[PDB]
């Protein structure tokens, strides 16, 4: 990846390695949608559009020759910059085991939020439709713990009326999960009963949404298309510090809307 | 270890062996912090200081040549003495299976308390900071059994917002644990639910502290540095008895303060 | 030595080589104490302290457990900077045999003076004691040439009363040596008689001190401890020039005060 001008910065190999590790650790836990969507492999730094498979007609009816144009989806590219101090970084050679890296962490969290927003709610300038837009698959629920089990039992019938099958997963909000744990008039652990009502599924808690949803996980319904993964490069020097950046290129699509149900 | 003048005392091999075994047994159960800290290997009887990796400037701004001094941590050495009676020790050769060794046991307990005090609360003359000093990672709790589960669930989110992961452990006071067992309005064993709320963690009870704390156990955050381990040597003879001693050399350090949380 | 960022400066190999040679030449003649002290080998860029071998007690007398701290000496680190012009340096490629390098020479002389000052007179903030501090080994002398021979003959007896032996060396001030040469009422070369009064010793003249001293040279009494030797590195660029620096890390110690005598 020579377009990242890494050999022109005044650092050493050990000073690059720790910067890589610290960012990898946080990304792994803070990316949420990659826990249950599919990923299509990288194409390269030159890929530009993804085809849809249709034609739009632009001529009259009395013509002898008729014509139209093909359709596609364009990709999104992003960039974000930060700065670091040099004397502090140079204590690693004298033997300090812990150095200060707060700006990197704040920038990483901002990028993760931006990425999750598009998957959950979509983008209008690009023509992307998000998971919460499909408003004809919503069913009601209740407050007491048994209403959750009743709702799950009712949802599996709607799943089975079509041909949909496979492992099932629940995605829920953390405050509501805490309230469900707090309010237990019946004496039985909630997690065991919930995991048994699904045929051995699993539960994911997150602060991104407000209510709950249920999805199927056989494979092939939600896809994320990548051109280049997340990377770090070099920009310039500011007489006491250095300036660096983060970048990426992607798009998203939903194929079969039959594998998703919304609660409340 | 020739600096321990063991060959000049009037004893036999069997009389040395039982003295070693009795002390090993008690140390194993009474040292508490070694259950969850890391240990860096021995360096020797001549090691004196551990480096930190910084410079302190001591000159003016208009100088042509500028200079400073490096920084480090000094080690601690201790010694404690006791006495034993000779006719009583000589019945082992006639065939007695149980002899009287109470002074050794009392001294061992005193040494163990001194060692744990520095880890939990620090030393000021040497420049050591202890686990209870970090006062910006404390959260509130309650009296009823369900408040404990709520607090644990809230703590794991703070852990996951950073990159911290791994097995988790709870350290609690024994009287409070007994009260929690006694007050069970809900009908379910507390230990199973507590061990399941953590993803398969464990619980440690101790009389050293007053409240509870939660720690991560991936490895590399709390370290104890040793020069020489615990040993026994010979001093002199007092016309009816013998005099012996115990000694050691050590220091302690905390690297990443992100893996620790304090309750109440 | 990657902590010296030499690969990021805009120079060539020939332009580095001559800069190295010119500094080596001057250091060799201008470092004076290395002519008669001992040198302990390099340890590295991370070494921080040198042990002394003692304990200081900090507890009371009625305690059951007693403790103290170990002792050591900290190292000294220095840094000094200068600047050079680029068009002038570029004539070496066209074929000029002599280029202008005056700033480097002035800086080198300043560093040499700073180094010799600590050996001859010590430093108070660090706890170093210098050769002229030991004030109980001083004997009187005279002005005429024969008084020097009388003083040397008297000094060798004090040396032999202890067990000290080996080659002997004289260190003297240059103006006083010139006056001794000028005032020769007796007709015999002074150097031959002086070198014969010692059992084949040698003479060193220097502008650092005021009076003379006599030392033994069997080996093992005065030691200089080094972490990193003298080196050159790169800092930045100033739109017409480049900026560079010099650095080092050391300490000094006197072991046996019986091998030294002071005159007048
Ligand atoms: C003893 C000393 C050591 C220094 N070490 C470094 C260093 O490792 N990295 C750095 O960027 N600046 C360092 N500086 C600051 C840098 O040299 C400063 O900008 C001027 O060059 C000091 O004259 C150091 C300054 C001093 C006095
Ligand atoms: C029968 C007898 C056996 C003894 N055995 C021992 C012994 O094994 N070890 C010991 O320290 N003293 C022993 N003593 C005490 C010791 O001998 C005492 O100080 C005097 O030497 C007794 O005259 C013994 C005394 C007696 C009378
Ligand atoms: C004929 C000529 C040769 C030059 N050669 C050099 C050179 O070798 N190194 C340098 O630093 N500047 C050199 N300069 C100066 C440098 O080019 C100047 O800053 C401007 O670029 C001149 O337009 C040269 C200028 C001239 C006119």
Curated annotation (Swiss-Prot), chains A, B, C:
Cofactor binding, per record: A flavin ligand is bound near the 3-fold axis channel; FMN is consistent with the observed density, absorbance data and mass spectrometry.
Subcellular location: Encapsulin nanocompartment
Domain of life of the source: Bacteria
Main location, first listed in the record: other
Record-level GO cellular component terms: encapsulin nanocompartment
Applied uses, from the record: Foreign proteins can be targeted to ectopic nanocompartments in E.coli upon coexpression with a construct using the 15 C-terminal residues of Flp (AC Q9WZP3), tested with GFP. There are at most 20 GFP per compartment. Empty nanocompartments can be disassembled by extreme pH or by 7 M guanidine hydrochloride (GuHCl); only reassembly from GuHCl-dissociated compartments allows incorporation of targeted cargo.
Resulting phenotype, residue 87 to E: Loss of flavin-binding. No change in iron storage or iron release under aerobic or anaerobic conditions
Activity modulation notes: Proteolysis activated by calcium and cobalt.
GO terms of biological process kind: intracellular iron ion homeostasis; iron ion transport; proteolysis
InterPro entries: ENCAP, Encapsulin_nc
Renumbered residue ranges of the record's region Pore-forming loop: 184-189
Cofactor (UniProt): FMN
Keywords: Encapsulin nanocompartment, Flavoprotein, FMN, Hydrolase, Ion transport, Iron, Iron storage, Iron transport, Protease, Transport
Temperature dependence as stated in the record: Optimum temperature for protease activity is 90-93 degrees Celsius.
Annotated GO MF terms: peptidase activity
pH dependence: Optimum pH for protease activity is 7.1. Nanocompartments are stable from pH 4-12, they reversibly disassemble at pH 1 and pH 13.
EC number: 3.4.-.-
UniProt binding sites for FMN: 79-81, 87, 90-94, 235
Spans through the membrane: none
PANTHER family: PEPTIDASE U56 FAMILY (PTHR37165), TYPE 1 ENCAPSULIN SHELL PROTEIN (PTHR37165:SF1)
Domain notes from UniProt: Has 3 domains; a discontinuous peripheral domain (P, 13-39, 76-133, 221-254), an elongated loop (E, 53-73) and the discontinuous axial domain (A, 137-216 and 259-263). The E-loop forms contacts between two subunits, while the A domain mediates contacts in the 5-fold interface. Pores are formed by residues 184-189, pore size can be modified by mutagenesis.
General function of this protein: Shell component of a type 1 encapsulin nanocompartment. Assembles into proteinaceous shells 23-24 nm in diameter with 2-2.5 nm thick walls. Cargo protein Flp (ferritin-like protein, probably stores iron) is targeted to the interior via its C-terminal extension; empty intact shells can be isolated in the absence of cargo protein. Fe(2+) may be able to pass though the 5-fold and dimer channels in the protein shell.
Record-stated family: Belongs to the encapsulin family. Family 1 subfamily.
Subunit structure of this chain's protein: Homomultimeric. This encapsulin nanocompartment is formed by 60 subunits; monomers form 12 pentamers which assemble to form shells. There are 12 pores where the pentamers meet as well as 3-fold axis channels and dimer channels; none are larger than 3-4 Angstroms in diameter. The N-terminus of the protein is inside the shell, the C-terminus is outside. Probably 3, 4 or 5 Flp cargo decamers bind inside the encapulin nanocompartment.
Other known facts: Shows substantial structural similarity to gp5 of the HK97 viral capsid; while the sequence homology is weak, it suggests this protein may have evolved from a viral capsid protein.
Protein name: Type 1 encapsulin shell protein
Species this chain originates from: Thermotoga maritima (strain ATCC 43589 / DSM 3109 / JCM 10099 / NBRC 100826 / MSB8)
């Amino acid at each position: 990846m020579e377009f990242l001008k890494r050999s022109f910065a005044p650092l050493t190999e050990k000073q690059w390695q720790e910067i890589d590790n610290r960012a990898r650790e946080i990304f792994k836990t803070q990316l949420y949608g990659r826990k249950f969507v599919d990923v299509e492999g990288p194409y390269g730094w030159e890929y530009a559009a993804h085809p849809l498979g249709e034609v739009e007609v632009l001529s009259d009816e009395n013509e002898v020759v008729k014509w139209g144009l093909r359709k596609s989806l364009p990709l999104i590219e992003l960039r974000a910059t930060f700065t670091l101090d040099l004397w502090e970084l140079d204590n690693l050679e004298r033997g300090k085991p812990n150095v200060d890296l707060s700006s990197l962490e704040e920038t990483v969290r901002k990028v993760a939020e931006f990425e999750d927003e598009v998957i959950f709610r979509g983008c209008e300038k690009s023509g992307v439709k998000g998971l919460l837009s499909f408003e004809e698959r919503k069913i009601e629920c209740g407050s007491t713990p048994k209403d959750l089990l009743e709702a799950i039992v009712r949802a599996l019938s709607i799943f089975s009326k079509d041909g949909i099958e496979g492992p099932y997963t629940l995605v829920i909000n953390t405050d509501r999960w805490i309230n469900f744990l707090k309010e237990e008039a019946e004496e039985e652990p909630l997690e065991k009963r919930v995991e048994e009502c699904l045929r051995g599924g699993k539960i994911i808690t997150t602060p991104r949404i407000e209510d709950a949803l249920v999805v199927s996980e056989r494979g092939g319904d939600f896809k994320l298309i990548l051109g280049q993964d997340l990377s770090i490069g070099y920009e310039d020097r500011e007489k006491d510090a250095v300036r660096l950046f983060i970048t990426e290129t992607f798009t998203f699509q939903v194929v079969n809307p039959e594998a998703l149900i919304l609660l409340k």
